Design a protein around this motif. Structure first.
Motif, PDB file in Angstrom:
ATOM      1  N   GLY A 122      48.866  23.506  65.052  1.00 36.06           N
ATOM      2  CA  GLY A 122      47.649  23.749  64.313  1.00 36.06           C
ATOM      3  C   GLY A 122      46.481  22.878  64.747  1.00 36.06           C
ATOM      4  O   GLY A 122      46.413  22.365  65.868  1.00 36.06           O
ATOM      5  N   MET A 123      45.547  22.714  63.808  1.00 36.19           N
ATOM      6  CA  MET A 123      44.289  22.043  64.112  1.00 36.19           C
ATOM      7  C   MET A 123      44.511  20.577  64.460  1.00 36.19           C
ATOM      8  O   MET A 123      43.970  20.076  65.453  1.00 36.19           O
ATOM      9  N   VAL A 124      45.303  19.871  63.649  1.00 42.54           N
ATOM     10  CA  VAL A 124      45.586  18.467  63.931  1.00 42.54           C
ATOM     11  C   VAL A 124      46.197  18.319  65.315  1.00 42.54           C
ATOM     12  O   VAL A 124      45.869  17.387  66.060  1.00 42.54           O
ATOM     13  N   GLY A 125      47.081  19.249  65.687  1.00 43.68           N
ATOM     14  CA  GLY A 125      47.741  19.159  66.979  1.00 43.68           C
ATOM     15  C   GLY A 125      46.768  19.207  68.138  1.00 43.68           C
ATOM     16  O   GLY A 125      46.908  18.459  69.109  1.00 43.68           O
ATOM     17  N   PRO A 183      36.011  11.852  51.851  1.00 43.00           N
ATOM     18  CA  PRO A 183      36.062  13.219  51.315  1.00 43.00           C
ATOM     19  C   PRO A 183      34.668  13.806  51.160  1.00 43.00           C
ATOM     20  O   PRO A 183      33.784  13.195  50.554  1.00 43.00           O
ATOM     21  N   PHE A 184      34.475  15.002  51.712  1.00 39.48           N
ATOM     22  CA  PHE A 184      33.253  15.752  51.471  1.00 39.48           C
ATOM     23  C   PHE A 184      33.405  16.784  50.363  1.00 39.48           C
ATOM     24  O   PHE A 184      32.409  17.400  49.971  1.00 39.48           O
ATOM     25  N   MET A 185      34.618  16.976  49.840  1.00 40.35           N
ATOM     26  CA  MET A 185      34.837  17.939  48.763  1.00 40.35           C
ATOM     27  C   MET A 185      36.129  17.540  48.047  1.00 40.35           C
ATOM     28  O   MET A 185      37.221  17.774  48.569  1.00 40.35           O
ATOM     29  N   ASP A 202      38.098  17.856  70.531  1.00 38.07           N
ATOM     30  CA  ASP A 202      37.551  16.529  70.294  1.00 38.07           C
ATOM     31  C   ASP A 202      37.222  16.255  68.833  1.00 38.07           C
ATOM     32  O   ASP A 202      37.012  15.090  68.476  1.00 38.07           O
ATOM     33  N   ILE A 203      37.173  17.284  67.984  1.00 40.98           N
ATOM     34  CA  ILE A 203      36.973  17.095  66.549  1.00 40.98           C
ATOM     35  C   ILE A 203      37.393  18.372  65.835  1.00 40.98           C
ATOM     36  O   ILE A 203      37.413  19.457  66.422  1.00 40.98           O
ATOM     37  N   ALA A 204      37.736  18.239  64.554  1.00 34.22           N
ATOM     38  CA  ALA A 204      38.144  19.350  63.708  1.00 34.22           C
ATOM     39  C   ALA A 204      37.419  19.247  62.377  1.00 34.22           C
ATOM     40  O   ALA A 204      37.411  18.181  61.753  1.00 34.22           O
ATOM     41  N   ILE A 205      36.811  20.348  61.942  1.00 35.40           N
ATOM     42  CA  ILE A 205      36.136  20.415  60.651  1.00 35.40           C
ATOM     43  C   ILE A 205      36.575  21.697  59.956  1.00 35.40           C
ATOM     44  O   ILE A 205      36.390  22.796  60.494  1.00 35.40           O
ATOM     45  N   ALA A 206      37.157  21.556  58.762  1.00 31.21           N
ATOM     46  CA  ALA A 206      37.776  22.658  58.032  1.00 31.21           C
ATOM     47  C   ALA A 206      38.302  22.148  56.692  1.00 31.21           C
ATOM     48  O   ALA A 206      38.219  20.942  56.421  1.00 31.21           O
ATOM     49  N   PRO A 207      38.836  23.023  55.813  1.00 28.06           N
ATOM     50  CA  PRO A 207      39.531  22.516  54.621  1.00 28.06           C
ATOM     51  C   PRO A 207      40.845  21.838  54.972  1.00 28.06           C
ATOM     52  O   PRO A 207      41.920  22.405  54.748  1.00 28.06           O
ATOM     53  N   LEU A 208      40.773  20.629  55.522  1.00 25.70           N
ATOM     54  CA  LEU A 208      41.951  19.899  55.971  1.00 25.70           C
ATOM     55  C   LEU A 208      42.338  18.874  54.914  1.00 25.70           C
ATOM     56  O   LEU A 208      41.544  17.989  54.580  1.00 25.70           O
TER      57      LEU A 208
END
Lengths: 50, 50
Positions: free
Chosen positions: A1-4, A33-35, A12-18
């Protein structure tokens, strides 16, 4: 997934409901935390005629 | 205050209800939030009569 894709270099970066978990923080570095959220309940209104 | 006693070495850690603000993040490393919160409202107990 995204972390992988972050750990293996495919991004180089991941932005999502993680979800900020400890198991992920061990391998990557999270931002603040942004949310904020939590588990909650969902039902009908209903209201119906009764 | 408490944040000052970390930058000046008079303390080694600050555990308290410390607001995670940007001006403080520039000078001290915050941990992730142990308690999410926000601004709220407070009113009296209604329907007291009669």
């Amino acid at each position: 997934g995204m972390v992988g894709e972050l750990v293996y270099g495919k991004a180089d970066i991941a932005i999502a409901p993680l979800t900020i978990t400890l198991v992920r923080e061990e391998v990557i570095d999270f931002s603040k935390p942004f949310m904020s959220l939590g588990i909650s309940i969902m039902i009908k209104k209903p209201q119906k005629s009764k």
